[PDB]
Write a protein that binds this ligand. Structure first.
Ligand SMILES: O=[N+]([O-])c1ccc(OP(=O)(O)O)cc1
Lengths: 513, 513
């Protein structure tokens, strides 16, 4: 036949992208368009759903146009996948086809008072009351609470609910609705699991929770899998229908973290990925049955290939200050000037020589949620240098994931098979070695680092028959796009002593108030 | 018609100085010569006693010569005083007049085992067992224990004992021997009070403690006051006898910290001085009656002018890492480039904004004595910067001073009417201010900073009639050498709160072992 290509809309917190992959899973064209970060009051954050929609469209037409110019064999896009900042929630009207307000972002803290109210007046003091249904604690992040808040506080949303015309939806749902010309009102299992309205075990809306939270099941879209025919692109808001040329289907939708889980090929229980960004997000595949957490971790859907096909579940954990710690050392503390020196300063010394640096700046998340913990350094002497402090910060990040992973191993009754990394800090070689050594598993660094975008591309491709099974997907990746591999290179005396030092250090962190 | 001159040899840890003062207490010639800091094993420090002797002689020869050029009539120095790093101990031979080995320094930790063996076998587990005799706990610093080591470890010293030719002394005794040709084997009360071998109230060698620790009294110098004839300079080591031109008497000997107390005119009880340098010490004049300590602090002789003169006593508190702390931030952490950036960055913020830096790099001294304490910072957030960390360090220093003064008031039964400062960090205004605001008293700063050297010249000039009395001495100082006063400026609640913050941070310093 001819060459095939799959497009991936990568819709993030600070920008939107379109990446076209070829059938070897190589990114052959990209365009990025940012969008405005609206901040009406301290701790609020909101996005313009229409601005986001036009960025997607822009990106699609620019990347397309750039590829035609450099690839004589590119004829059309076979299918489009979507991946998105999760939890961000949009309200819009079924007949005007427009938003009723801006979109509160995942990390938006306006829903706080609703969240304290729900914990008390519905869970009787327990934030975990519905964690066996949803997999989730009561929290400001999850969508129901933002939905509730827009019902309570946006007269326009209240009204349209009463007309029977209101649509709520995560960014996947919204993007798919407009791309479709308003014909498709859908969502995938991974986005739907971050709403607080889906029953993990069935992956359907929960009549009980919707009732109990007073969100009407008329407002919610149809839950579908990650990989299947969602709709077609039927708009032309920035040249896009012209650019795609043929009608082009939408056949992949997956929340960003799960999209990275998928794009890093974590198809089997025990396989986990970590993104080393500003924070860390670690996800492990735990298998075909939902596993619930007794360490404060999130249970979520990992991925679902095919409608009502197999559903792999996952456990998710975070740390707030990974990349942010490195940036803090530089710009607040002058411990170095630009990012290259971070790793070389940390390599200049054989170890931390006693010190521990717990970068608990905005508390400890992970499996020891403690908002009172603060940034603390212990063990220093006159022989202590910035080299050691920088190295200890690398150890700290790796120690936290280790704790997170330890908790996941216990909640799930599995061992960690391998950890794939992506993110800025995955380019710090030393941090990968300290991590491999602590976890006692191989760490895998793909050199094609666009793993989030690839997840959604893989979903669309499987469904459109560009790739014909997960095994073919792994073969192509392992052959074409080369992984760097990083084996444990440390003794069990050192491992055990580093974790013991860390354990002792964590006791000394309590400070705020 | 012509100016009368007094000489001071200032034999410090890292160098030797000779200062010549006029009868108006102005330094008119100075010369300085550094000596080698030998460190055979880790935590060991050791000096070459011939190097030290010869350094002092070069200092006298050159300072003398530089003065003749400024003043061609100067025919002689009236008298020469000695002040010296204390506790540092020389072993020598009565007839060869030469060191048997190198001299272990005040902060040398080779005596550690011997320090334990003593606390148990002689002291029944109590380190304060001779507190009421010596004014001291059992510790690595004091000269007896170094004496003991050289008998158990140095063939030449163990041996020279047998023949009746072994001499031991502190650096005063050693300089003063060699300066005199061998004709003088003496020590002053302040230096003697640091041997662990002298009764504080009586200023006698204690036959009980000698006996107990296996130190034969045959090796020990005759104790004198700080102000009287010790001997004459009768050597030509660098033309020194010649340069002096006349037989010049040594009429001053005083341990370095006491010398600063004396040189800052701290004659009344409640008057205290805080010195920064190769080590950092606060000394309070407590009066004619000796006071002992319930809160770590050391009891010692302040000074005694003359054989039949009254003995004024003092309490002594140390801190271990003071100027070292600033240089550590500079040289190890790169928090600033040069010394003037420190006070500025610290000034650029309103406060510590919730952080505390306990700079206990080598344990907590003062009234806490915790050798397990290490350097620790607590409270940090992403809003913490180097300005806060540097400011915090300065607060820690004042906070430690404050806790040391607290202990001193309780022990002595007095308030601190005045604190005079000198050494390095006295040039930092912000620190002086933070210090004044915590002790709630005045801080005096000499423009004629050379006050340690002054003390021994004052001793030697009092004995030789250059000044006739303590009153004339203080009258001239006031007349000649200008002050700078720093007054408190804060609340009771600022103070109370900063101290409670500090007291909780201390709980989190235990780390070593
Ligand atoms: O890890 N984070 O806190 C985080 C994650 C995503 C962000 O934005 P994005 O990288 O454009 O999706 C910004 C910050």
């Amino acid at each position: 036949f001819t060459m095939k290509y799959v497009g991936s809309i990568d819709q993030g917190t600070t920008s939107t992208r379109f990446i076209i992959f070829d059938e070897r899973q190589r990114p052959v064209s990209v365009h990025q368009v940012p969008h405005t970060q609206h901040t009406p009051h301290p701790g609020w954050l909101e996005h313009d759903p229409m601005e986001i929609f036009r960025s997607a469209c822009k990106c699609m037409s620019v990347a397309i146009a750039k590829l035609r110019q450099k690839d004589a064999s590119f004829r059309k896009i076979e299918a489009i996948g979507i991946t998105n900042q999760r939890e961000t929630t949009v309200a819009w009207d079924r007949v005007t086809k427009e938003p009723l307000c801006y979109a509160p972002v995942w990390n938006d803290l306006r829903t706080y008072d609703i969240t304290k109210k729900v914990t008390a007046e519905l869970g009787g003091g327990d934030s975990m009351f519905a964690s066996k249904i949803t997999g989730l604690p009561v929290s400001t992040y999850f969508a129901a609470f933002k939905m509730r808040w827009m019902l309570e506080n946006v007269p326009a949303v209240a009204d349209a609910c009463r007309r029977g015309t209101l649509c709520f939806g995560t960014i996947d749902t919204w993007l798919m609705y407009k791309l479709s010309g308003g014909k498709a009102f859908v969502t995938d299992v991974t986005n739907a699991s971050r709403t607080f309205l889906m029953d993990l075990r069935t992956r359907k809306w929960s009549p009980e929770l919707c009732e109990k939270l007073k969100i009407p099941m008329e407002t919610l879209p149809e839950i579908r899998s990650n990989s299947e025919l969602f709709g077609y692109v039927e708009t032309d808001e920035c040249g896009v229908a012209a650019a795609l040329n043929e009608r082009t289907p939408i056949m992949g939708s997956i929340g960003d973290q799960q999209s990275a889980l998928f794009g890093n090929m974590c198809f089997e229980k025990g396989e986990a990925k970590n993104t080393y960004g500003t924070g860390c997000f670690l996800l492990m595949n735990v298998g075909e049955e939902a596993r619930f957490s007794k360490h404060g971790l999130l249970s979520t859907v990992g991925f679902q290939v095919g409608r009502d096909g197999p559903c792999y579940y996952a456990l998710e954990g975070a740390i707030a200050c990974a990349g942010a710690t490195v940036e803090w050392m530089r710009r607040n503390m002058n411990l170095f000037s630009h990012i290259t020196e971070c790793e070389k300063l940390a390599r200049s010394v054989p170890g931390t020589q006693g010190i521990v640096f717990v970068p608990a700046f905005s508390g400890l998340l992970a499996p020891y949620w403690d908002p009172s913990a603060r940034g603390t350094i212990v063990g220093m002497t006159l022989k202590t240098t910035r080299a050691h402090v920088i190295r200890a910060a690398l150890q700290a990040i790796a120690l936290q994931l280790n704790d997170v992973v330890g908790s996941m191993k216990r909640d799930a009754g599995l061992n960690l098979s391998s950890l794939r990394v992506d993110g800025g800090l995955s380019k710090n070689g030393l941090l990968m070695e300290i991590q491999a050594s602590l976890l006692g598993v191989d760490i895998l660094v793909p050199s094609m680092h666009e793993t989030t975008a690839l997840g959604a591309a893989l979903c669309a491709g499987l469904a459109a028959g560009v790739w014909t099974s997960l095994e073919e997907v792994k073969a192509v990746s392992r052959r074409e796009n080369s992984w760097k591999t990083v084996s444990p290179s440390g003794s069990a005396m050192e491992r055990e002593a580093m974790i013991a030092e860390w354990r002792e250090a964590l006791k000394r962190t309590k400070w705020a108030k």
